Amino acid sequence: KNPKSDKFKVKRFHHIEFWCGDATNVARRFSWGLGMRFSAKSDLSTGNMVHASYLLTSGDLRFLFTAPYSPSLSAGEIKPTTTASIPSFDHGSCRSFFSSHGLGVRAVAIEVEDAESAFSISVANGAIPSSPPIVLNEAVTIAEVKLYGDVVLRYVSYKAEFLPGFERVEDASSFPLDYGIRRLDHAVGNVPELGPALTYVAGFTGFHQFAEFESGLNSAVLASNDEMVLLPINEPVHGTKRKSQIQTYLEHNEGAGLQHLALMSEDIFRTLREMRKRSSIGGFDFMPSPPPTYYQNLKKRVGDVLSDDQIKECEELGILVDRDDQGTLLQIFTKPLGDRPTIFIEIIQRVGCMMYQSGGCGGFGKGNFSELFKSIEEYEK
Ligand X SMILES: Cc1c(C(=O)C2=C(O)CCCC2=O)ccc(S(C)(=O)=O)c1-n1c(=O)cc(C(F)(F)F)n(C)c1=O
Q: What residue ranges bind Co ion (CB under 5 A)?
A: 262, 346, 364
Q: Rule CB under 8 A: say whether 28 interacts with its own copies.
A: yes
Decide whether 12 or 37 has the Cβ nearer to Co ion.
12
From the list its own copies, ligand X, Co ion, none, pick the one residue 293 interacts with, judged by a Cβ distance below 5 to 8 Å according to partner type: none
Strand partners, 191: none
91 is in an annotated binding site: no
CB of 352 to its own copies, least distance (A): 35
Q: Rule CB under 8 A: say whether 150 interacts with its own copies.
A: no
From the list Co ion, ligand X, its own copies, none, pick the one residue 307 interacts with, judged by a Cβ distance below 5 to 8 Å according to partner type: none
Binding to its own copies, residues 309-348 (CB under 8 A): 337-341
Find the discontinuities in the chain where C to next N exceeds 2.5 angstroms and give the residue preceding each.
160, 213, 355
Strands 230-236 and 181-190: parallel
In the chain, what are the helix, strand and coil shares in percent, each to the nearest 5?
Answer: 30, 35, 40
Tally Cβ neighbours within 10 Å of residue 99: 10
Residue 262 has φ and ψ, to the nearest 5°, of -100, 120
Using CB under 8 A, pick the residue from 9, 11, 29, 182 that binds its own copies.
Answer: 29
Amino acid making up residue 305: V
| Residues at the interface with ligand X (CB under 6 A) | 186, 188, 219, 232, 234, 245, 260, 262, 287, 333, 346, 364-366, 368-369, 372
Q: Which of 201, 171, 193, 187 is nearest to 229 (CA)?
A: 187
260 is in an annotated binding site: yes
Q: Which of 204, 255, 225, 304 is nearest to 5 (CA)?
A: 225
Q: Rule CB under 8 A: say whether 81 interacts with its own copies.
A: no
Q: Return the range that interacts with its own copies (CB under 8 A); candidates 62-70, 262-270, 317-325, 363-371.
A: 62-70
Q: Rule CB under 8 A: say whether 83 interacts with its own copies.
A: no
Residues annotated as binding site for Fe cation? 186, 260, 346
